Symmetry: D2
Subunit: 351 residues, 4 copies
């Protein structure tokens, strides 16, 4: 019942200011933190060798897009490797990102691990030496981080243990980050896999987020200095019943309104497999939803921002312009979407 | 991880509509649910015998004030006895309240009890047969209820047990209420007793509300069909350090923003021993706080709406008009306060 | 992190002494606490009008059984009504029970209530005014009490809410009891209904008991002054796989060993629908189980001690001695069973 | 509410068999898993240079004591470095340990880290890549592991958060260990630091253990395949009120009886700064405590088994036999203590009476 301030007023101000700049009106996040193993399949989808130079060239392609993306990109999440690479002109990538008005982010978790005694459920590791890593990343230009936990809707999942454990590890990660001037993006992703319907996803999301915020509270997390990266509430991939973007928006916004304290600076949705256009339309519908929303509702897209660019590039240098144009187009669409101003041209009691 | 809908879309609508009517813009709650015991000292101070007729008369005095209070009062909380009494014109009090555009509320808890193994901490009882009681109160005109839990800031309080237990019982009470079409006002009051400062009260308030909402989630409570009746965040009653109404407002709004989901329809502050003017001024500063507030921030005052009316009445029938006049003045003042339109005459530090 | 003794050394000794007397070697509990409604079916099966007189006579029949039951019965659980009734010779039933060497117990819960948002799950009510009731019961002869929570094994049950809520209410009941010199029998019954197998029951029993004891710890419960009344670990009633009594014993003892602290004075198993002979044979196997058991493993049988007696009686006073003989036989059988001396004539797999 | 067996019957048998061998009647654990930074002051006190060779030598001194310790030592906890060192004869230490009938253990936690927002409280790290580390350690001779969590008694500690977080990480560590055939020793140490009395320590120990076992249940831990390494229940090191060995034993056994499920195979007490003689005497009293104890109550001493040895060695190779003799003496005494058959005479020596307490 006694307070022992985890953060000073100055530390809180820095964390809060960073969080707000990332999700400022019209801005979202480019999630380009795919690891070597993760970026492997993506590079082969266009028949390109998975070398460090090709990964540098590709990341450079996205980060050096023209000034049209500047007002669209509030932040860029990078993988460790990319944080220390440089553009052709010799500029460190984080410098490139900042010069264009973006805040630099760094993925810091070390992947999921199986939870014994569960039906294929996992938790996420990466807390060991995390404080030292955050201190170093901060010094090297990063101001926010990302940690991904994965939950799955199934027969007996997410289980009580999976929910409690993932919620608890996120809080620890958030706690260590804030001690080092790093704004933590809390990502409790509920996979869309399965034949469950919209209300099932909404129910689970509601229970997951309630657990997440109780954990953050127990660990004394400064919410104004954090961001939330949740899945949108949608039916399962194999769901037979069809839903409109308006229903997906209502279910998503309702789930958030029932669990996310208004103190949380912003919600940056993951695209989780949605097509580029689908992810944009949904985000737009979410922002159009006729319910009060006390936090910024924007994007933190990986696939939803890179699909076309990757394809347009094909691993050929001559395609650089064509590839960047594709990325710029998605950046613009989503910039409008997080403001509910997107257009193809450019009963809540039932929830 | 499986849903078994506690409420149908129809029941949700009913609860949500009720909650919104109670806290509609510029409206607040008159808490006149004092038991014979708590009202005892009130009437005693004014040398008035605590009879059933005197209590009926006094309640009548408040409930029948002129229409000027209509836009100020969204709801009135009554004690069992009063829910079944009638005004001089034969009109039962619930009807009197409704005809004035107010929703009828009923106190349902059965008081605090001691938690063994704690330093004077308590939990609250009253769950036994609560479902049948709610169904009957609903039939008799009540659309919302009140249940009060009490927590205290001390050397070792509130303890983990007290927070968890009080949070859990509030959830049980809320669950049973919603099953009977009654909007539950969740009241986790943290007493102002003690010499702790503003930051301490904010800390404890944040921890208690986080516990309350996690409990309500575990029990499948429909937040849109509930109201929150918390203490404002203020320094202890005996704190040597002094603060401004703006600091109290900032502390209060910050604590709420960090713990109360936007889905909660409204927050109805208890006065907790504050003077009538102080309660209105703080409520005003709260609504003027330069932070986003996704819920109505109004009042559910007992003492802060009756202090002057009770003294003006003095137990004399010929002082009826004068007594009501004082109540109206406080109703008007607070109606303006919950909108930030009342005039008596660096948030990172929180 | 700071202690505020819920009990004094004297209060502890009293509770521990009572708890130990009830489960002394060779002794068990006769659960005769059926309410008018729960005993209705039983009386109907024998075409006997459910009147206070017939109930009084039936209870008298059991309580006045000959001295052979004395070393078999350490305690007797009564329903409120019976605690205040007298034998034909005028002796109050509590006095009759005590004159035969038994401790008097009383049921104090007020039945189960539905938990909104769950698949037919429940919690139990009865805390309101419990302290006052316990003090009164203590004064009137009772030294221990019983409170029944009910959980069910199903596709989604018991849920996290049900397990948590039932464990918490059991802890509240336990605390209140100990504050009044009453030994609480904690009964978290997991129904045998369903087609689940033995390992499913064991898993669920382990999870429920782990929850029960964490709750008792959180509420500062003096374990040495309590008793546990759990279900034995068995397959569901509709399960098609067959098991031996040795397997039921191994699963039951393994589950208890993994969750019940050694400090718990005793485990008094409910018969939960098992026949008289089955309940005795299982209790026997449980006591002969190779594993080390730090607590007494006896009975707290209702149906398993009355089946044959109720039938031999048929509501006919002429069958008094025939009926009592049946009860006496089961009392003797179970006394031997709780010692592993009854005869009707790879633990890593758990 | 549905089961998904974390372990097969075979895995359970292997884990249970290991746990029982470590705490078999009369047997205890030698805790020699001090890190270079930890064993630094130890070697410093005896003017011994903290080199890898000196550490290797000192560990060999303990591990190669004569056969009299065989019946006394059920297990030996080692530090990563030592697990891969060899004795003068070329034999890997794990083999030396096994040849003497002991089980090899390995310390796997990566130390304590501060819990933000608390009054100097910590949690412990070391879960990253623990699964792979355990599989490797297993292949290299280790059959059990140790992970240390540290809690402190104070005005506001241990806090609800510290208790919950530490109990949770211990459970994660135990879950990963059991998945790799490694028996985890759960160590939730409540420091003796402070002026609190006996009942205060008992109260805190009871709350901490209840939290630890609830977490272990939540994480589906096989208790029979685990060991508990707790602090004995004693007054604070600065407490004015004095207590007898019988009272300490009573408080300790009572705390354990109210929280530790009978399924737990054994409790291996940490000496926590107690002198060698004090640790042995208390363990003896604990085993003679009248109350029923469904689990083996033995030792897992670090300081309490090495105090006299270190002093007798002094870094001098010529004092090998002298040093080992002191170790053997403490091992024999504790072997009897964990059987409630220890009765000091007066020859222990001033080194076995010195307070091995170290503030934090």
């Amino acid at each position: 019942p006694h307070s022992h301030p985890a953060l000073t007023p100055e530390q809180k101000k820095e964390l809060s200011d960073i969080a707000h700049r990332i999700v400022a009106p019209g801005k979202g996040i480019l999630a380009a933190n795919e690891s070597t193993g993760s970026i492997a399949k993506r590079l082969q989808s266009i028949g390109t060798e998975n070398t460090e130079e090709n990964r540098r060239f590709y990341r450079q392609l996205l980060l050096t897009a023209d000034d049209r993306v500047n007002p669209c990109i509030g932040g860029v999440i990078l993988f460790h490797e990319t944080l220390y690479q440089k553009a052709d002109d010799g500029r460190p990538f984080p410098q490139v990102i900042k010069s264009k008005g973006g805040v630099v982010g760094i993925k810091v978790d070390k992947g999921v691990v199986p939870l014994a005694g569960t039906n294929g459920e996992t938790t996420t590791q990466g807390l060991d030496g995390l404080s030292e890593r955050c201190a170093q990343y901060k010094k090297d230009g990063a101001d926010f981080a990302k940690w991904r936990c994965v939950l799955k809707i199934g027969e007996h999942t997410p289980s009580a243990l999976a929910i409690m454990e993932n919620a608890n590890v996120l809080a620890r990660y958030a706690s260590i980050c804030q001690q080092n001037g790093i704004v933590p993006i809390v990502e409790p992703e509920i996979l869309p896999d399965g034949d469950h319907d919209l209300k099932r996803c909404q129910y689970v999301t509601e229970k997951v987020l309630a657990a997440v915020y109780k954990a953050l509270s127990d660990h004394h997390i400064y919410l104004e200095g954090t961001l939330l990266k949740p899945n949108m509430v949608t039916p399962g991939h194999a769901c037979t019943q069809k839903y409109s973007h308006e229903e997906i928006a209502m279910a998503t916004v309702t789930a958030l309104r029932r669990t996310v304290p208004p103190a949380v600076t912003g919600v940056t949705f993951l695209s989780g497999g949605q097509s580029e256009e689908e992810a944009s339309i949904n985000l737009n519908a979410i922002n159009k939803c006729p319910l009060l929303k006390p936090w910024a509702l924007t994007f933190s897209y990986g696939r939803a921002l890179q699909a076309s660019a990757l394809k347009a590039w094909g691993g050929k240098k001559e395609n650089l312009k064509a590839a960047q144009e594709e990325y710029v187009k998605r950046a613009l669409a989503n910039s409008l979407a997080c403001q509910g101003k997107y257009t193809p041209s450019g009963s809540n009691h039932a929830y």
